[PDB]
Amino acid sequence: KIRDRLAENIHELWGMNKIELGWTFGKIRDDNKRQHPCLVEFSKLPETEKNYNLQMSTETLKTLLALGCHIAHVNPAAEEDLKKVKLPKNYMMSNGYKPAPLDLSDVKLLPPQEVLVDKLAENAHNVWAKDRIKQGWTYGIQQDLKNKRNPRLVPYALLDERTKKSNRDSLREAVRTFVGYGYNIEPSDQELA
C-alpha cells in the first residue's frame, strides 16, 4: 500500500517541480512551448509512467529491506494526522490538475535515518554507475557521446556536492514520506559481524 503511495508522491514531486521549471500542460509534447502530456493525476497517468513509478518505489523498498530494516505500520494514527500542501493558484494547469505534495515540513528524521539516506544515495550511485559501465561508459573529464565518457564515474566520497545533494534530498523526502504514513524505518539489530 505504501508502494502505491510513494510512487504517487514522487509523481507529485514530479508535478510542481515542472511548474517551477516553467513547463505547461498540453495534449502534445513540445519543448518549444514546454508542454508535457504526462502532467495529470496518478489515476489518469499512462501505464508506462505508472509502472516506472511503481518500479522505482519497489526498488527503493527492496534497497531498504536488503539492509535488514524492519518496516511495520505500528502507528497508523499519524496517517490520520497527515495532510497535503495547498499550492496557490499559479500551480494550476489548463486542465485543473493541481499537484498535492504531502505536508512533511513537521516530519523530522533521526541521524540513523540520515545515515540510511546516505546509504540509499550510495546504493543509487552504485546502481547508476554499474548501469553506465554496462552500457560501455568509462571515466572521462570531457563528456562526449561517441567515446562514452562520464565525469561522475567516481567513488562516492569524491563526487560533486550538488549532485550528491539533490539525490540525498530526494531520498530524504522519500524517507519522510515513509515515516509520515506511520511506517517504522528501524534498521537491523545484527550489525556486529
From TrEMBL:
Belongs to the ryanodine receptor (TC 1.A.3.1) family. RYR3 subfamily. It comes from the Eukaryota. It comes from Neovison vison (American mink). It is found in: Sarcoplasmic reticulum membrane. The chain holds residues 867 to 1059 of 4859 of the full protein. This is Ryanodine receptor 3.
